[PDB]
């Protein structure tokens, strides 16, 4: 099922930092941090990364449980914010859920944390 995910997109974001791509990613975990800002652990099938943050405008996707752990989604707009220590935060501005958590059912592949 790893052929469904954009393998290498996490490395591309962390290296090139370009925002033109529209990667297909699996949500591994979603945690509110505090009004809530949701932090996501995402997988591209090869790697995971936990510095994804949901824009507030997308909170209804979490609240209505369309975006939830194990769902597959496609990012349509995101912003990269590189911190002074070199880590990158990825703010998801627009996305579409392609396959529900219930329909996927399980973590895809055996992704390992990026670097």
């Amino acid at each position: 099922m790893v052929g469904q995910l954009s393998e290498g997109a996490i490395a591309a974001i962390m290296q090139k930092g370009d925002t033109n791509i529209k990667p297909i990613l699996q949500v591994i975990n979603i945690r509110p941090i505090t009004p809530p800002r949701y932090r996501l652990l995402m997988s591209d099938g090869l790697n995971t990364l936990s510095s994804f943050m949901l824009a507030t405008q997308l909170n209804p996707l979490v609240e209505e449980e369309q975006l939830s752990s194990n769902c597959v989604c496609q990012i349509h707009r995101f912003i990269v914010n590189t911190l002074k220590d070199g880590r990158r935060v990825v703010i998801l501005m627009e996305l579409e859920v392609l396959k529900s958590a219930e329909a996927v059912g399980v973590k895809i592949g055996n992704p390992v944390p990026y670097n």
Binding site: I33, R37, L49, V89
Partner: peptide
Amino acid sequence: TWEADDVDDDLLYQACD
């Protein structure tokens, strides 16, 4: 380099400003 803890959570929250 990213963890489930208050300092990282707060840095991530602030980065969305």
